[PDB]
Design an enzyme around this catalytic site. Structure first.
Site, PDB file in Angstrom:
ATOM      1  N   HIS A  51       0.751  69.593  36.333  1.00 32.47           N
ATOM      2  CA  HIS A  51       1.174  69.879  37.703  1.00 32.47           C
ATOM      3  C   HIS A  51       0.974  68.587  38.488  1.00 32.47           C
ATOM      4  O   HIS A  51      -0.166  68.151  38.694  1.00 32.47           O
ATOM      5  CB  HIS A  51       0.368  71.038  38.297  1.00 32.47           C
ATOM      6  CG  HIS A  51       0.877  71.529  39.623  1.00 32.47           C
ATOM      7  ND1 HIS A  51       0.989  70.713  40.731  1.00 32.47           N
ATOM      8  CD2 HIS A  51       1.287  72.758  40.020  1.00 32.47           C
ATOM      9  CE1 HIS A  51       1.451  71.417  41.752  1.00 32.47           C
ATOM     10  NE2 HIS A  51       1.644  72.661  41.346  1.00 32.47           N
ATOM     11  N   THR A  52       2.076  67.950  38.893  1.00 28.48           N
ATOM     12  CA  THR A  52       2.016  66.614  39.482  1.00 28.48           C
ATOM     13  C   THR A  52       2.468  66.579  40.934  1.00 28.48           C
ATOM     14  O   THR A  52       2.605  65.488  41.506  1.00 28.48           O
ATOM     15  CB  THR A  52       2.860  65.635  38.660  1.00 28.48           C
ATOM     16  OG1 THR A  52       4.205  66.107  38.624  1.00 28.48           O
ATOM     17  CG2 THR A  52       2.330  65.544  37.240  1.00 28.48           C
ATOM     18  N   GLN A 102       8.321  61.843  33.217  1.00 28.36           N
ATOM     19  CA  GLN A 102       8.481  60.389  33.240  1.00 28.36           C
ATOM     20  C   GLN A 102       7.826  59.757  32.026  1.00 28.36           C
ATOM     21  O   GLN A 102       8.450  58.979  31.288  1.00 28.36           O
ATOM     22  CB  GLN A 102       7.871  59.795  34.503  1.00 28.36           C
ATOM     23  CG  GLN A 102       8.606  60.119  35.798  1.00 28.36           C
ATOM     24  CD  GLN A 102       8.101  59.293  36.962  1.00 28.36           C
ATOM     25  OE1 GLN A 102       8.838  58.490  37.539  1.00 28.36           O
ATOM     26  NE2 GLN A 102       6.835  59.518  37.348  1.00 28.36           N
ATOM     27  N   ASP A 133       5.522  75.904  27.174  1.00 25.38           N
ATOM     28  CA  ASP A 133       5.049  76.239  28.515  1.00 25.38           C
ATOM     29  C   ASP A 133       3.527  76.237  28.485  1.00 25.38           C
ATOM     30  O   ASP A 133       2.895  77.177  27.996  1.00 25.38           O
ATOM     31  CB  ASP A 133       5.615  77.584  28.958  1.00 25.38           C
ATOM     32  CG  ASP A 133       5.219  77.956  30.381  1.00 25.38           C
ATOM     33  OD1 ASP A 133       4.479  77.196  31.036  1.00 25.38           O
ATOM     34  OD2 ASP A 133       5.665  79.023  30.849  1.00 25.38           O
ATOM     35  N   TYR A 165      -3.481  62.648  29.745  1.00 28.76           N
ATOM     36  CA  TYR A 165      -3.446  61.727  30.879  1.00 28.76           C
ATOM     37  C   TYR A 165      -4.166  62.330  32.077  1.00 28.76           C
ATOM     38  O   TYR A 165      -4.158  63.545  32.282  1.00 28.76           O
ATOM     39  CB  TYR A 165      -2.016  61.364  31.280  1.00 28.76           C
ATOM     40  CG  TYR A 165      -1.289  60.730  30.145  1.00 28.76           C
ATOM     41  CD1 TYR A 165      -1.330  59.359  29.952  1.00 28.76           C
ATOM     42  CD2 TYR A 165      -0.627  61.513  29.220  1.00 28.76           C
ATOM     43  CE1 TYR A 165      -0.693  58.776  28.841  1.00 28.76           C
ATOM     44  CE2 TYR A 165       0.016  60.946  28.140  1.00 28.76           C
ATOM     45  CZ  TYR A 165      -0.028  59.591  27.954  1.00 28.76           C
ATOM     46  OH  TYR A 165       0.613  59.071  26.857  1.00 28.76           O
ATOM     47  N   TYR A 169      -5.155  68.699  43.089  1.00 30.22           N
ATOM     48  CA  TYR A 169      -4.670  67.932  41.949  1.00 30.22           C
ATOM     49  C   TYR A 169      -5.818  67.221  41.245  1.00 30.22           C
ATOM     50  O   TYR A 169      -6.026  67.399  40.045  1.00 30.22           O
ATOM     51  CB  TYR A 169      -3.621  66.932  42.421  1.00 30.22           C
ATOM     52  CG  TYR A 169      -3.111  65.993  41.360  1.00 30.22           C
ATOM     53  CD1 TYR A 169      -2.291  66.451  40.332  1.00 30.22           C
ATOM     54  CD2 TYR A 169      -3.412  64.634  41.418  1.00 30.22           C
ATOM     55  CE1 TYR A 169      -1.804  65.580  39.363  1.00 30.22           C
ATOM     56  CE2 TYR A 169      -2.918  63.753  40.458  1.00 30.22           C
ATOM     57  CZ  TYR A 169      -2.117  64.241  39.447  1.00 30.22           C
ATOM     58  OH  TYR A 169      -1.631  63.382  38.499  1.00 30.22           O
ATOM     59  N   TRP A 213       0.094  56.277  40.151  1.00 29.83           N
ATOM     60  CA  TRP A 213       1.307  55.835  40.825  1.00 29.83           C
ATOM     61  C   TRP A 213       2.438  55.589  39.821  1.00 29.83           C
ATOM     62  O   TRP A 213       3.040  54.510  39.772  1.00 29.83           O
ATOM     63  CB  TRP A 213       1.028  54.567  41.634  1.00 29.83           C
ATOM     64  CG  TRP A 213       0.005  54.710  42.762  1.00 29.83           C
ATOM     65  CD1 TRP A 213      -0.904  55.715  42.952  1.00 29.83           C
ATOM     66  CD2 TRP A 213      -0.178  53.791  43.841  1.00 29.83           C
ATOM     67  NE1 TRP A 213      -1.647  55.471  44.099  1.00 29.83           N
ATOM     68  CE2 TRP A 213      -1.218  54.296  44.659  1.00 29.83           C
ATOM     69  CE3 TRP A 213       0.428  52.586  44.190  1.00 29.83           C
ATOM     70  CZ2 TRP A 213      -1.655  53.634  45.809  1.00 29.83           C
ATOM     71  CZ3 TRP A 213      -0.002  51.931  45.331  1.00 29.83           C
ATOM     72  CH2 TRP A 213      -1.031  52.465  46.137  1.00 29.83           C
ATOM     73  N   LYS A 245      -7.395  68.248  37.665  1.00 33.10           N
ATOM     74  CA  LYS A 245      -7.297  67.208  36.639  1.00 33.10           C
ATOM     75  C   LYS A 245      -8.672  66.845  36.087  1.00 33.10           C
ATOM     76  O   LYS A 245      -8.835  66.678  34.872  1.00 33.10           O
ATOM     77  CB  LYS A 245      -6.598  65.958  37.188  1.00 33.10           C
ATOM     78  CG  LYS A 245      -5.098  66.108  37.403  1.00 33.10           C
ATOM     79  CD  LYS A 245      -4.321  66.329  36.095  1.00 33.10           C
ATOM     80  CE  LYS A 245      -4.179  65.074  35.276  1.00 33.10           C
ATOM     81  NZ  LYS A 245      -3.091  65.227  34.215  1.00 33.10           N
TER      82      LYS A 245
HETATM   83  N1  LIG Z   1      -1.559  60.834  40.476  1.00 35.61           N
HETATM   84  C1  LIG Z   1      -1.573  60.249  39.240  1.00 35.61           C
HETATM   85  O1  LIG Z   1      -2.519  59.534  38.917  1.00 35.61           O
HETATM   86  C2  LIG Z   1      -0.447  60.516  38.361  1.00 35.61           C
HETATM   87  C3  LIG Z   1       0.911  60.270  38.698  1.00 35.61           C
HETATM   88  C4  LIG Z   1       1.892  60.585  37.757  1.00 35.61           C
HETATM   89  C5  LIG Z   1       1.539  61.109  36.537  1.00 35.61           C
HETATM   90  N2  LIG Z   1       0.184  61.305  36.241  1.00 35.61           N
HETATM   91  C6  LIG Z   1      -0.273  61.896  34.988  1.00 35.61           C
HETATM   92  O2  LIG Z   1       0.425  61.374  33.863  1.00 35.61           O
HETATM   93  C7  LIG Z   1       0.938  62.494  33.096  1.00 35.61           C
HETATM   94  C8  LIG Z   1       2.474  62.582  33.242  1.00 35.61           C
HETATM   95  O3  LIG Z   1       2.867  61.653  34.163  1.00 35.61           O
HETATM   96  P1  LIG Z   1       4.493  62.052  34.841  1.00 35.61           P
HETATM   97  O4  LIG Z   1       4.537  60.979  35.872  1.00 35.61           O
HETATM   98  O5  LIG Z   1       5.296  62.040  33.569  1.00 35.61           O
HETATM   99  O6  LIG Z   1       4.511  63.474  35.569  1.00 35.61           O
HETATM  100  P2  LIG Z   1       5.907  64.345  35.524  1.00 35.61           P
HETATM  101  O7  LIG Z   1       7.017  63.351  35.471  1.00 35.61           O
HETATM  102  O8  LIG Z   1       5.745  65.402  36.581  1.00 35.61           O
HETATM  103  O9  LIG Z   1       6.047  65.141  34.086  1.00 35.61           O
HETATM  104  C9  LIG Z   1       5.434  66.382  34.246  1.00 35.61           C
HETATM  105  C10 LIG Z   1       5.787  67.193  33.026  1.00 35.61           C
HETATM  106  O10 LIG Z   1       5.137  68.484  33.061  1.00 35.61           O
HETATM  107  C11 LIG Z   1       6.200  69.397  32.893  1.00 35.61           C
HETATM  108  N3  LIG Z   1       5.810  70.750  33.282  1.00 35.61           N
HETATM  109  C12 LIG Z   1       5.810  71.361  34.556  1.00 35.61           C
HETATM  110  N4  LIG Z   1       5.418  72.652  34.510  1.00 35.61           N
HETATM  111  C13 LIG Z   1       5.166  72.885  33.143  1.00 35.61           C
HETATM  112  C14 LIG Z   1       4.730  74.016  32.436  1.00 35.61           C
HETATM  113  N5  LIG Z   1       4.471  75.180  33.117  1.00 35.61           N
HETATM  114  N6  LIG Z   1       4.552  73.990  31.075  1.00 35.61           N
HETATM  115  C15 LIG Z   1       4.828  72.790  30.463  1.00 35.61           C
HETATM  116  N7  LIG Z   1       5.250  71.628  31.000  1.00 35.61           N
HETATM  117  C16 LIG Z   1       5.410  71.715  32.371  1.00 35.61           C
HETATM  118  C17 LIG Z   1       7.292  68.779  33.803  1.00 35.61           C
HETATM  119  O11 LIG Z   1       8.467  69.455  33.794  1.00 35.61           O
HETATM  120  P3  LIG Z   1       9.231  69.848  35.407  1.00 35.61           P
HETATM  121  O12 LIG Z   1       8.740  68.651  36.223  1.00 35.61           O
HETATM  122  O13 LIG Z   1      10.710  70.001  35.181  1.00 35.61           O
HETATM  123  O14 LIG Z   1       8.417  71.080  35.786  1.00 35.61           O
HETATM  124  C18 LIG Z   1       7.318  67.417  33.111  1.00 35.61           C
HETATM  125  O15 LIG Z   1       7.807  67.508  31.810  1.00 35.61           O
HETATM  126  C19 LIG Z   1       0.313  63.778  33.712  1.00 35.61           C
HETATM  127  O16 LIG Z   1      -0.916  63.985  33.092  1.00 35.61           O
HETATM  128  C20 LIG Z   1       0.116  63.390  35.147  1.00 35.61           C
HETATM  129  O17 LIG Z   1      -0.982  64.015  35.758  1.00 35.61           O
HETATM  130  C21 LIG Z   1      -0.775  61.030  37.139  1.00 35.61           C
END
Ligand SMILES: NC(=O)c1ccc[n+]([C@@H]2O[C@H](COP(=O)([O-])OP(=O)(O)OC[C@H]3O[C@@H](n4cnc5c(N)ncnc54)[C@H](OP(=O)(O)O)[C@@H]3O)[C@@H](O)[C@H]2O)c1
Ligand code: NA
Length: 298
Positions: free
Chosen positions: A66-67, A13, A41, A104, A130, A155, A134
């Site tokens: 890992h989200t 995202q 990867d 992030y 998680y 969120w 993190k």
């Molecule tokens: N709870 C929170 O506070 C929260 C919520 C959202 C996001 N965030 C943080 O913001 C950042 C991204 O936000 P997002 O919402 O964009 O999360 P996201 O949409 O899940 O994007 C995750 C990325 O990681 C990739 N990924 C998964 N396994 C991987 C691997 N083994 N090697 C490399 N890349 C891999 C995913 O690809 P696939 O999904 O196809 O595996 C996707 O490109 C992250 O640091 C996340 O922790 C935090």
């Protein structure tokens, strides 16, 4: 001359919006785990290190993680690889190059107590894998590369990708009643805001390196998941959407338990970021209304 920017997690995202926002800052090399030419990867520790060594970036932006919070409780090794060990490798390799590293993190590094907007230097105390992995990655980056920006957010939603807003909008097409948690509070933060403020912060930190550090980067205000969903439906109906949903019933977190224990207070103060980088962070409703409108094709 153009700076070299390495973007990891380009398909997520936030990563998708970073492909846009970073594109005017320099030459972007963007990868995700499916890339064939470069290793994207983040769980392949030697491969992702070789990618940093090959690209020789001036800035590394890590949007990979890992989200899947509930799945993380039964995927502890993978969560540690993606959110901690991989981040440590990125920190070490970027610091060898003198590169600025952007990473992030999450409101889930905190224990969810209280009802205040958390400041950055409150003690952490994650309740779930998680958040634990993190926070470990945060510490790895702090120790590994002083030239960093850590943005805790919450969120996250976007027009492209899976998230609560789009899931609610889909379910409201089919279900007459929805029972949604009303005692977890936080700020829905758009991938757009995260990507644009990241680009702004990178430019400002290259200019004033003293701005390196940790920031809460969220939209302003707060809502429960329940009122968030109600707002999504309000916007959708204002744009002519026909929805089946009639009532959204608020329920406590105790009503139906989840594998991962979740914090109740996810409020993060975003004052440090606003003051450091000279930005306005709008109320959370604005970015959500925009995504609902785009998802509906309006
Ligand atoms: N709870 C929170 O506070 C929260 C919520 C959202 C996001 N965030 C943080 O913001 C950042 C991204 O936000 P997002 O919402 O964009 O999360 P996201 O949409 O899940 O994007 C995750 C990325 O990681 C990739 N990924 C998964 N396994 C991987 C691997 N083994 N090697 C490399 N890349 C891999 C995913 O690809 P696939 O999904 O196809 O595996 C996707 O490109 C992250 O640091 C996340 O922790 C935090
Ligand atoms: Na340099």
């Amino acid at each position: 001359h153009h700076m070299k920017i390495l973007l990891i997690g380009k398909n997520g995202q936030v990563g998708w919006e970073l492909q846009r926002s970073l594109s005017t800052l320099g030459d972007v090399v963007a990868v995700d785990y499916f890339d064939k030419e470069l290793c994207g990867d983040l769980t392949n520790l030697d491969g992702i290190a070789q990618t940093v060594r090959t690209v020789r970036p001036d800035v590394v932006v890590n949007a990979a993680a890992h989200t899947a919070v509930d799945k993380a409780e039964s995927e502890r090794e993978l969560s540690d690889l993606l959110n901690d060990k991989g981040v440590a490798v990125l920190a070490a390799e970027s610091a060898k190059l003198g590169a600025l590293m952007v990473h992030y993190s999450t409101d889930y590094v905190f224990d969810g107590a209280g009802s205040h907007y958390r400041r950055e230097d409150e003690a952490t105390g994650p309740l779930n894998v998680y958040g634990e992995t993190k926070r470990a990655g945060e510490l790895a980056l702090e120790q590994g590369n002083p030239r960093h920006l850590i943005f805790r957010t919450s969120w996250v939603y976007a027009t492209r990708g899976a998230n609560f807003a789009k899931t609610m909008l889909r379910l409201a097409g089919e279900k007459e009643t929805l029972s949604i948690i009303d005692d977890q509070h936080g700020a829905p933060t758009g991938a757009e805001l995260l990507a644009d403020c990241t680009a702004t912060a990178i430019r400002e930190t290259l200019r004033d390196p003293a701005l390196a550090g940790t920031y809460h980067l969220v939209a302003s205000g707060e809502t429960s998941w329940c009122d968030y969903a109600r707002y999504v439906f309000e916007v959708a109906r204002a744009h002519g959407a026909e929805l089946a949903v009639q009532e959204v019933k608020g329920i406590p977190t105790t009503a139906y338990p989840t594998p991962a224990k979740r914090p109740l207070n996810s409020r993060l103060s975003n004052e440090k970021f606003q003051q450091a980088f000279g930005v306005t962070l709008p109320d959370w409703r604005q970015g959500v209304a925009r995504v609902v409108t785009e998802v509906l094709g309006k």
